[PDB]
Amino acid sequence: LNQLKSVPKARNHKTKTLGRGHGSGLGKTSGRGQKGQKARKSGLTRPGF
Amino acid sequence: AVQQRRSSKHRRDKRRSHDALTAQALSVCQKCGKKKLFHRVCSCGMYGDLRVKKAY
Amino acid sequence: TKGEVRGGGKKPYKQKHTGKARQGSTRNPHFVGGGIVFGPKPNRNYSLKLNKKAHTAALHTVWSEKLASDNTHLVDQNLFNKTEGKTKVMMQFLKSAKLLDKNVLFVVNTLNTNLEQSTSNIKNVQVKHLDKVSVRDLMLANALLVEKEVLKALEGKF
Amino acid sequence: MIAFAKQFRVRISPQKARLVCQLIVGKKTADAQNILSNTPKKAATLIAKLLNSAIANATNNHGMNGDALYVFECVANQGPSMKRTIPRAKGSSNMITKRSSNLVVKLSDNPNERQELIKQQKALVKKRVEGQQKAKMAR
Amino acid sequence: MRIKGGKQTRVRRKKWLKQASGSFGTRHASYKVAKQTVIQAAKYAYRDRRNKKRDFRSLWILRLNAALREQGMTYSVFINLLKKHNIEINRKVLSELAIKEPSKFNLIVQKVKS
Amino acid sequence: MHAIVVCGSKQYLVHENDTFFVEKLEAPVGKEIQLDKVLMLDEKIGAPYLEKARVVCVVEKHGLQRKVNVIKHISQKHHLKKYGHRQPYTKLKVVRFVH
Amino acid sequence: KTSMLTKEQANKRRQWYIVDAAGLVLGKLAVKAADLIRGKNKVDFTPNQDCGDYLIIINSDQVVLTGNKKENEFWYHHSQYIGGIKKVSGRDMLKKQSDKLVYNAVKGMLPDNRLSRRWITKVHVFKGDKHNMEAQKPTTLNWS
RNA sequence: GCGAAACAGUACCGUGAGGGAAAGGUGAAAAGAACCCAGAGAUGGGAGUGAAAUAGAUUCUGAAACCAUAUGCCUACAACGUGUCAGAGCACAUUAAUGUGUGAUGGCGUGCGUUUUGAAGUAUGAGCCGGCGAGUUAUGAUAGCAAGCGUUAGUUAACCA
RNA sequence: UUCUCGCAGUCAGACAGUGGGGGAUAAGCUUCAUUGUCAAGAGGGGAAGAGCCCAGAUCAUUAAAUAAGGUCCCCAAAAUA
């Protein structure tokens, strides 16, 4: 293995760019519905709650 | 009232079509030089073949 | 970022009877003057953990494939002697040994002052101690002139 | 040739300059200055001064015929104007700019030199296409 | 590492403005309306890519019907004499181009007779 | 003197020294191709095709139509799948179209 | 893939024709007249050119109307104003304007197009036969 | 980019606690244009300098938007989200290619997002152009992928050379 | 579509027919159970229609046979008794 062709066998996975383009959605949709409480900032609840 | 829809450049030139200005009237002066203004005196002080005015 | 720059603390405009968005602030990331929330900060460690035996095995394998590169000829302190460390005789020695193309490493256990003086102004070549070389520093040399003494240490380290 | 002389940003409405040079468009040297002289516009005097200056330069620095020249092309170029402000009632003021015009008039001495620019463009595209074609030989 | 990229955005906008031009108005000089018109025209082309053959079929049928009314019968009568008896597999548009070359479809009309 | 030649499902009228564009085909340029599916040569008609009819053509070139850029998009629904395509075709001419 | 379409273009000829109006039913004669003017019978119909023919109508007064339509269906006309509604019957047209009725009916049969006006110009309806169109080499026929 | 690369906490606003910016690039050396002309002059172009003055101080480049001119085509009967496909005609000559540009006429043709049961809409956002412009990281857990190691395995933490 | 795991998503649906409740058995009305459609789905016919009938679009296709429906013309084709 040399720096001109240094590659592992395989290591890569899909990433979530929630505000980039329309390819996998991942935009205004954000993969969390539309006009929902979860979609809001810190939209969540207490773990026990 | 105030403007509701903007006028485009095509609309602008359609409105400005009447911007062409008419020409003036000219007259020949037998004694002085350049073509004078019709029904007006000439720069050389003379008008109906008549000089009544001082230095132009 | 936005919260770490001083400035005003008021809405620059009245709330009602306006024709724009109310405001964020005078200091806003969407306004001129910086304030981007995300970027480099002195909180990231920029470090990762690896097993010791993993590194030993990696070094052993890269030495195995390095030993077969037929550029691993032996060296001894004798030729590092008979020289004052001046690049002149060093330049002649490297040129005679066709080392201009190579970035050859010189493994050494003692780091004699003459060799340290030599090769100090050649970015192509580099030299350090036996137990200071990394895999990147190993495979980038394209050649290495090995010493008799380091064989015992590398065999012990496997 | 051109016999042009740029004015470099006199403050006047560009529309009025365009109008007066329409009044002078197509006309030759003998029938342009006379009418331009006594028309009641100030921009008329402005363009007349520069037209006389350009005629003088053409006679001096080019030595052309000077008796068949006519306006080849009028322009009305909007130079960078200034930003002035006058207060307006009930605390809502406005910024008023004095429009500035860049004025120049080209003087041609023949019924041509417009198609010759097309010939220059044709030579430009011809050298472009032959350079592309000569590159294809190496391809 | 702060990055500002304008070259790629500029070439993208230029290439998306390049397809369409010759438009009434400065619409072919902006990005928003130009892109909207490009997409609308693409939809127009998608629909017309079938509407054109839809209209061509009608054109062929109209012209063959006119030619057959020169012969003196309805369009439907001649079709029924192409599969079982007097088998013809010639298509509609060719029976029309046989009209632009006269004295050739007369052979066909004399063939469809008894 | 004429010929109705069928390629795929498209019929074409041809005569002597006629050049035309048809679907992309095998047997690349320079090679003669003799299609037996041709009808209406000279006053003779067969039911599926004209009997013993042989039309021989020589290919002049293999070309591509202009790249149509087709879109699918419904307003206010956020889908803009894009695709472009160049249509392969063959420009070729007939020589004899013998009986 | 496709066969190159072959049509005719830059070709224009409109043969002058003459018909004599009679007791024939207005609608069924007028549809045929319209299709002949537009050229729906030509083997070389050209939509963007419409190489039709000129036609002249003689003695439109002889047309009769079936049923009670002479006193059942009446044509109105509103020009631009409230109260401008003026309605006349078919027999009133016999007294004043029968040609214009056929004119408007045919124009109605023609789709509203820029060329449709140019096609109806090719129709010359006359209550009589006094005109200088004999020098235009007309064509006398029936059931046009 | 410390707010502030400049005479910046300066200009400015307020009677004050305070707020608060923008505006670098001549040339290799001003060698910043002797001299000429027209204009009162500024100025303009010559000359002249300079490798070069579409490098002349508006000073590296000078994009889009916007404003005019002109090659050539079409347009004064004309009901259209202005374009698509045809389609003669007209002007022609290319990243050699069913070459390109315009389009008499025909056929077709209620925008782009928003959220709503459902938006062609008289629901809202947009005057335009260009630039900038908003899902990262620290520790922690879970699930998946891979590799190392290996069934009294391993990893080392903080730390030391 | 059976079991584990990751992972949202909505809890405001709408309409026509079918059996209905309210209403006044009036409503593009409301409240259910069935089918279907739109939303998330283009197409033809119904003149122009989210909803009906015929139907489910990979790309090209100046080819054909068809579904509902239709054949005086606009606007595509039919007549005979």
Add this chain to the structure above:
RNA sequence: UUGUGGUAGACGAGCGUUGUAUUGGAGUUGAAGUCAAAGCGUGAGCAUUGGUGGAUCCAAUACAAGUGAGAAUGCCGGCA
């Protein structure tokens, strides 16, 4: 063989950018940026040349991102 309508939502595969790291190359006999063009691409793109212009980068592989812009009565400037 089924085939490829698709939002919400889920999976897969990529392109493009900045800089770094070595591995090669280009260049004031004209690189980058710039505008036009009668090409190439399944897609985000790749170009080839003409002219503006005179100085730095580019091909391949990984690396880590303030990385991909029409919209938020988004910000600056100019122009309508």
